[PDB]
């Protein structure tokens, strides 16, 4: 922990010539990556990995050049990208992350203005000509098909009948659906309320973590806004945002979300196979049983 910070302080000062670290603390952390707050002013995201930060950096650059908006996003001042190590540094966007608790304290009018701000942001981003980042495409259906092939080549035959049926029933739905055939555009693609920042009037002031962004189905950016869970605000919130956003089939957006949710245990298994992490394989398989029995 105090050791973790030291290594990273060392790396930051080694790769960024005149940068002096006076303070550094961990502010966020997954199984792939760690984020640090440095000098109480800079966020540094770091990853020991093509699975690095080149695309994410290209997207910040494209967005900072082409969006016209008052909503802040990361603006990369420092970067180091190699095969084994990636670092992005940018000034911290100040604010309070949106949560369900906070939303519930807001007045009706505050909630509306927040929704309108979100809809506006998404409309502007989805309307950009993405020619200049055209290499950042993501085909979710094809990705799933390839992940299924990887399953068939590795552990599929050791799975139980219940697990196999869950997977085959998902593949059948994937084959019948039309929700991947609509408009493609640049999406944030991890658009949950823990990535939305509010200012002191409860208005949207910033958006972070475009680390999964790319050119993908328009429906992608409504997946968490439509989610019913403890972490997200609720389906009505997403529905209202969709009405404000306009010119989009809401029932398809919901079908897209439902499909991505059904995929989740399989995505988890596949993550464990690819990263040689048995814990994830086991968790995904257990989750299939939990869903089958509800
Ligand atoms: N206030 C503030 N916090 C930030 C900012 N950038 C990152 N953070 C904090 O650092 C955490 C990690 O940043 P994030 O980009 O989401 O990292 P990640 O590796 O992509 N995590 P994940 O993909 O799992 O959401 C965020 O959850 C948030 O707590 C920022 O500009 N402002
Ligand atoms: Cl297992
Ligand atoms: Mg991220």
Swiss-Prot record:
Briefly, what is this protein's role?
Answer: Involved in resistance to gentamicin, tobramycin, and kanamycin. Tobramycin and kanamycin resistance is due to the ACC activity, specified by N-terminal region. The C-terminal region is a kinase that phosphorylates several 4,6-disubstituted aminoglycosides.
GO molecular function terms here? aminoglycoside phosphotransferase activity; ATP binding; N-acyltransferase activity
Q: For this chain's UniProt record, which GO biological process terms are given?
A: response to antibiotic
Binding sites annotated in the UniProt record for a gentamycin: 209
Q: Which residues of the full protein are shown?
A: 182 to 478 of 479
Annotated TM spans: none
Q: Report what the protein is called.
A: Bifunctional AAC/APH
Q: What's the EC number here?
A: 2.3.1.-, 2.7.1.190
Q: Which residues form the active site?
A: 190
């Amino acid at each position: 922990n105090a050791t973790n910070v030291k290594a990273m302080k060392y790396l930051i000062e080694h790769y960024f010539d005149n940068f002096k670290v006076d303070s550094i603390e961990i502010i966020g952390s997954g199984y792939d990556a760690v984020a640090y707050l440095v000098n109480n002013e800079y966020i540094f995201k770091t990853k020991f990995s093509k699975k690095g930060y080149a695309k994410e950096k290209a997207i910040y650059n494209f967005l900072n050049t082409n969006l016209e908006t008052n909503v802040k996003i990361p603006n990369i001042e420092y970067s180091y990208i190699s095969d084994e190590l990636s670092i992005l540094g940018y000034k911290e966007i100040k604010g309070t992350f949106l949560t369900p608790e906070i939303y519930s304290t807001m007045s009706e009018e505050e909630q509306n203005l927040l929704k309108r701000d979100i809809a506006s942001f998404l409309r502007q981003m989805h309307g950009l000509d993405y020619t200049d980042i055209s290499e950042c495409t993501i085909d979710n259906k094809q990705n799933v098909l390839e992940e299924y092939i990887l399953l068939r080549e590795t552990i599929y035959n050791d799975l139980t009948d219940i697990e196999k049926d869950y997977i085959e029933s998902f593949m059948e739905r994937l084959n019948a659906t039309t929700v991947f055939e609509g408009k493609k555009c640049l999406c944030h693609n991890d658009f949950s309320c823990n990535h939305l920042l509010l200012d002191g009037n409860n208005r949207l002031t910033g958006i972070i973590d475009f680390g999964d962004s790319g050119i993908i189905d328009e429906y992608c950016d409504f997946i968490y806004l439509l989610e019913d869970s403890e972490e997200e605000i609720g389906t009505n919130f997403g529905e209202d945002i969709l009405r404000m956003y306009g010119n989009i089939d809401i029932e398809k957006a919901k079908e897209y979300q439902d499909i991505v949710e059904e995929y989740y245990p399989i995505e988890t298994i596949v993550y464990g196979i690819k990263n040689i992490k048995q814990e994830f394989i086991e968790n995904g398989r257990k989750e299939i049983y939990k869903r089958t029995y509800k």
